[PDB]
Every structure is written in structure tokens, then in C-alpha cells.
């Protein structure tokens with residue numbers, strides 16, 4: 001539930017997001033900080049070192065796809081449940097990803113946005129983005145509900 | 146999502162549940178095992194010792210009310226979200242209870258049912274009741290979603 | 291973990307006695323039935339009711355828990371190899387440890403009605419929580 | 430944790446330097462804005478933007494974190510009174526500790542872009558997690 005000011009701020013900040021690096025950075029940071037999530041990406045090659053994780057082309061491409069999904073969810077903020085129905089099916093009935101990792105990834109993305117934008121990532125902007133990522137995780141975890 | 150056999154088993158076991166003691170037992174065990182939940186019941190008197198908690202008439206009466214709510218939810222398994230709308234309002238917007246505590250209380254209730262029924266509380270019965278309490282907690286936490 | 295918690299856990303696990311392997315198998319069966327997402331960690335296992343593989347795994351888990359009860363003051367040193375196995379080769383999600391702890395508590399409550407007082411319940415909850423943190427301490 | 434984790438955390442908190450109180454106040458403000466349920470814990474507080482009470486509380490939290498960094502090998506003994514306060518008197522739900530840890534990490538990332546490498550991020554996350562477990566070990 002975003003106010004018009006929150007929606008405008010989120011859209012404005014997302015307009016400046018590099019769509020080729022931010023998603024891969026967030027996915028790599030998730031893999032480094034929560035190493036049990038590496039279980040789901042054993043076909044991605046070497047993930048033993050954080051340098052190896054952040055240097056993985058497979059991780060970069062998958063992060064690009066995840067960032068594209070996040071952008072699609074941001075484009076439809078009032079239909080998150082219907083936007084992420086297929087992805088929820090894929091993540092739950094095929095991958096068995098515990099939905100706590102969805103919120104972990106959302107928080108890692110918030111940290112990445114803070115690290116990229118610095119002072120521009122004000123506490124109100126962060127609160128709006130926390131609302132956004134919580135909604136995205138809830139929509140993605142619908143199959144278990 | 147309970148199968149007809151799961152629904153029949155849950156109803157049969159609930160038929161033999163003491164509606165005057167089980168809810169108080171579950172609430173007192175929640176207060177003893179997770180003592181940060183005592184912060185919501187500071188008007189209930191002495192809660193310092195397990196014996197004081199399990200001997201509290203206020204705890205017993207409140208547990209009776211919670212057991213009645215659980216019975217109402219069990220009689221309406223296909224409308225849990227609409228059954229617990231008012232209680233979700235009360236718990237979230239008025240009391241600010243974290244939704245994790247709802248699942249904690251559901252698991253404590255499962256433990257109490259196991260303790261009361263022994264070998265009759267079979268693993269299939271437990272799985273059906275786990276589905277029930279997960280649905281109840283989800284319905285109660287809807288206001289935060 | 292207080293000395294009262296240690297006494298309570300030692301007494302409860304002593305009354306568990308020689309039924310520990312059967313109790314662990316029952317707890318694993320309960321975990322598989324209640325949380326079927328936990329079965330993905332045992333792809334080569336036969337997880338049907340009465341399975342000898344589940345019986346043996348439950349015996350192993352129960353024996354590890356008995357060793358932990360014997361070494362409450364030295365659990366991190368007693369469970370070092372197990373922590374290494376779970377956190378690194380297995381990559382087990384830490385929520386599954388809560389699930390298994392709950393199923394173990396349910397098995398204990400269903401098999402020892404007299405012993406499962408609220409204080410013993412709290413002590414066992416804390417003991418299984420500490421075991422879970424030791425097994426996930428390598429993250 | 431690890432020796433490399435300790436080195437990373439010490440370097441990051443040294444780079445925080447004399448901005449620790451301001452950073453802690455900013456983290457508390459972020460927690461209040463992103464998670465309004467945290468505000469219930471501070472009812473007699475003025476939690477508006479630029480509040481001197483929030484400034485002082487952030488200074489206190491930052492000084493406690495600096496002491497924890499200085500005593501990374503003796504955190505349970507360094508944080509005993511704080512754990513007693515938070516678990517017995519305040520009875521803070523342990524999820525809010527995760528919330529405050531995330532807000533602290535966000536403040537650090539927003540203020541130290543060069544220092545917030547993935548390895549430093551992992552080290553800081555581990556350090557704040559250990560602080561939270563020490564503060565929640567007295568229920």
C-alpha cells in the first residue's frame with residue numbers, strides 16, 4: 001500500500017537503476033551472505049569464494065532476469081499477486097524455495113540500492129521500497145499460503 | 146487445503162477436546178516457552194513462574210476465548226480469511242502482535258494436543274492439524290499482508 | 291541453558307531411554323508428513339511408512355541427540371563434524387531445523403504425557419534450539 | 430565468526446569513526462519509518478524527524494556497538510547488562526533485532542559505498558547477528 005508520493009519516489013529512483021548490474025549484484029550478495037541459498041544454484045559453476053560468486057556470468061544473467069521480474073512487478077503495484085503467479089508456481093511447486101529467502105533477497109536488494117544511491121536513498125525512499133519488496137515476496141510466496 | 150479424510154480426522158479429534166482447559170494450557174505454555182509474549186499480558190497479574198502462569202485464572206479464561214476462536218475457525222475451514230477478519234484487525238492494528246507468534250501459538254497447541262491424546266495423535270492427524278493452524282495463522286496475519 | 295534446564299532435559303531424555311531411535315524415526319516421519327518440502331533433502335531415500343532407511347536415520351539423529359545431552363556444556367565441540375556436514379555439504383536451510391525441533395517435541399509430548407510439563411517443555415525447547423544453532427553455527 | 434570477519438568489521442567500524450552516533454540515530458529513524466511496529470517499544474519518546482531523544486538513543490546504541498566491536502571475542506560478557514535489560518525488562522520480540530540489523534546495514538551501505546564490498550557486507554551481517562543472539566539469550 002503505497003501513497004502517491006511513495007509511488008513517485010520509487011519510480012523516480014528505479015529510473016536510474018542500471019538494469020544490467022544491480023540484479024546480478026543483489027543475487028551474488030544473497031549467495032555470499034546466506035550461503036545455504038547456493039544449494040539452488042549448483043549448476044552455476046564455482047561459488048566457493050565471494051570473488052568467484054560476483055564474477056559468475058551465470059549469476060549475472062540470472063540476476064538480470066530477477067531484476068526484470070522486479071521491474072515488471074514495480075510496473076504493476078496493484079496486481080502483484082497476479083503478476084507473480086507463474087513465478088510463484090515455479091519457485092514453490094518446482095524449486096521448493098522457503099519463502100524466508102524471498103524477504104532475504106528483498107532486503108539484499110534494498111542494501112544494494114542504498115550502496116548505489118547513497119544519500120539519495122533517504123529513509124522515506126527506503127520505507128517505500130521495503131513496502132514494495134515485502135509485497136513482491138508475499139506475491140511470490142502465495143502458493144504456500 | 147484439507148482432504149475429506151483430513152477434515153474428518155480433525156473433526157473427530159476436536160470432538161474429544163476439553164474446551165475449558167486446552168486453550169488455557171496452550172496459552173500458558175506459550176507464555177512460559179516464549180516469555181517475550183508476556184509483554185502483551187501485563188494486566189494478567191503474576192507471570193514470573195511457570196506455576197504462576199499455569200495457575201492464572203485470567204490466562205485460563207483468555208485461553209478459553211482463544212480455543213473458542215479456534216473452534217469457530219475449524220467449523221469454517223473454507224472461509225478462514227473471512228472468519229478471522231475482526232480478530233486480525235484487533236491483533237494487528239490495535240495490539241501490534243508479530244505474525245510469527247501466531248505460528249508459535251499454533252505449534253504450542255499442536256504440542257498440547259499431542260500431550261493430551263498420545264498415540265491417537267498420529268502423524269497424519271498432526272499433518273492435518275498443522276495445515277489447520279497454518280491456515281489460522283495466515284488468516285490472522287492478513288492485515289499485515 | 292540453566293542448570294534447571296540441564297536437569298530437566300537429562301531426566302526427559304533418560305525416560306526416553308532405549309526408545310530413542312524409534313522416537314527419532316517417528317519425528318522424521320512427522321516432519322516428512324507435515325512439511326513435505328523437507329523431503330527434498332533425501333532424494334535417494336525411501337520415505338514411505340516403515341522404511342528401514344528412515345529407521346536408521348532416526349537412530350543416527352537420536353544417537354547424536356543423546357551425545358548432545360551427554361555433552362550439554364560442550365555441545366559445539368561434540369557436534370563439530372555434524373555442523374560441518376549440515377552447513378557445508380548439505381546446505382540445509384535453517385528453518386528446517388525449527389521444523390525438526392517441533393516434530394521432536396511433538397513426538398516427546400505424544401510418548402511421555404507425564405514428563406511433558408510446561409517447565410520440561412521449555413527446557414527441551416531451549417535444548418533443541420541450542421542444538422540447532424550449533425548445527426547452523428557454520429553459516 | 431572468523432578472523433577475516435573480525436578484521437572486516439573492525440575496518441568498517443573504524444571507517445564509521447566519529448559518525449557512529451549519527452549513524453545509529455539514522456538507523457533508528459529508518460527502523461521507525463520502515464517498521465512502525467518498532468515504535469510501540471518507545472511510547473514516551475518523541476519519534477519525529479530530528480528528535481534529540483532519538484539522537485541520544487542512537488548515540489547509546491552506536492556506543493554499545495563500538496564496545497562490542499572492541500570486545501568481539503568477549504561479546505557475551507561485554508553485553509550482559511544490555512541482554513538483561515532487553516530480554517527481562519523490555520521483553521523485545523526477537524524479530525525487531527533483525528529489523529534493526531537490516532536498518533544498520535542499510536545505513537552503513539548508504540554512507541560507506543567503497544567499504545560495502547560483499548565480503549564486508551557478510552562480515553557485518555554476521556557481527557550484527559551475533560550481537561542480536563547475545564541480546565536475546567536471556568528469556
Ligand code: HEM
Pocket residue numbers: 037040041065066069070087090091095097101102103105106136137140
Ligand atoms: C525474491 C524475489 C525473486 C524474484 C523476483 C525471482 C525471479 C525469478 C525469475 C524471473 C526466474 C526465471 C524464471 C524463468 O526463467 O522461467 C527465477 C528462477 C529461479 N529462481 Fe527466483 N526469484 C526470486 C527469489 C529467489 C530466491 C530467493 C531463490 C533461491 C534461494 C530463487 C531461486 C531460483 C532458481 C533456482 C531459479 C531457476 C529455476 C528455473 O528457471 O526453472 N529465486 N526467479
Ligand code: HEM
Pocket residue numbers: 182185186210211214215232235236240242246247248250251281282285
Ligand atoms: C494464533 C491464534 C490466536 C487466536 C485464534 C487468538 C484469538 C483471540 C481472541 C478470541 C481474543 C479475544 C478478542 C475479544 O475478546 O474481543 C484475543 C485477544 C487478544 N490476543 Fe489473541 N489469539 C491468537 C494469538 C495471539 C498471540 C500469539 C498473542 C500475543 C503474543 C495474542 C494476544 C492477544 C491479546 C493481548 C488480546 C487482548 C485484546 C483484547 O481482548 O481486546 N493473541 N485473541
Ligand code: HEM
Pocket residue numbers: 328331332350351352354355372375376380382386387390421422425
Ligand atoms: C536436531 C537436528 C539434527 C540432528 C541431530 C541431525 C543429525 C544427523 C546425523 C547424525 C546425520 C548422519 C551423519 C553421519 O552419518 O555422519 C545426519 C545426516 C543428514 N541430515 Fe541431519 N540432523 C538434524 C537436522 C537435520 C535437518 C533439519 C535436515 C533436513 C531437513 C537434515 C538432513 C540431513 C541429511 C540430508 C543427511 C544426510 C543423510 C544421508 O544422505 O544419508 N538434518 N543428520
Ligand code: HEM
Pocket residue numbers: 467470471489490491493494511514515519521525526529560561564
Ligand atoms: C544491535 C541491537 C541493539 C543495541 C546495540 C541496543 C542498545 C541499547 C542501549 C545501549 C540501550 C540503553 C541502555 C542503558 O541506557 O542502560 C538500549 C535501550 C533500549 N532499547 Fe535497545 N538496542 C538494540 C536493539 C533494540 C531493539 C531492536 C529494540 C526495539 C525494537 C530496542 C529497544 C530499546 C528500548 C525500548 C530501550 C529503552 C530506552 C529507554 O526507555 O529510554 N533495542 N538499547
